[PDB]
UniProtKB/TrEMBL annotation, chains A, B:
Transmembrane segments: none annotated. It comes from the Bacteria. This is Phage major capsid protein, HK97 family. It comes from Rhodobacter capsulatus (strain ATCC BAA-309 / NBRC 16581 / SB1003). It is found in: Virion.
Amino acid sequence: GYTIAERPDLRVLRDPFSAKPHVLFYASKRVGGDVSDFAAIKLLKFAA
Amino acid sequence: GYTIAERPDLRVLRDPFSAKPHVLFYASKRVGGDVSDFAAIKLLKFAA
């Protein structure tokens, strides 16, 4: 049902240069995903 | 007549730190030159 597309690495870039008296760590990871198969998932609704 | 002085390269310094989600390539080659033998270049002025 759910397909998770992603890049399997959390790239880090510590920045001793921009904010000179600080270090300014920068971490980013790329991920995405929605239902690829609408048949493979069913839900339980509590209405009626 | 004309002499060019240069460094035969292109120095690219990518800077992932100034603009954080960008890379900001900073490239700079240095070149200079003027006429070295003034007798070897004539011109055609259109005045009179």
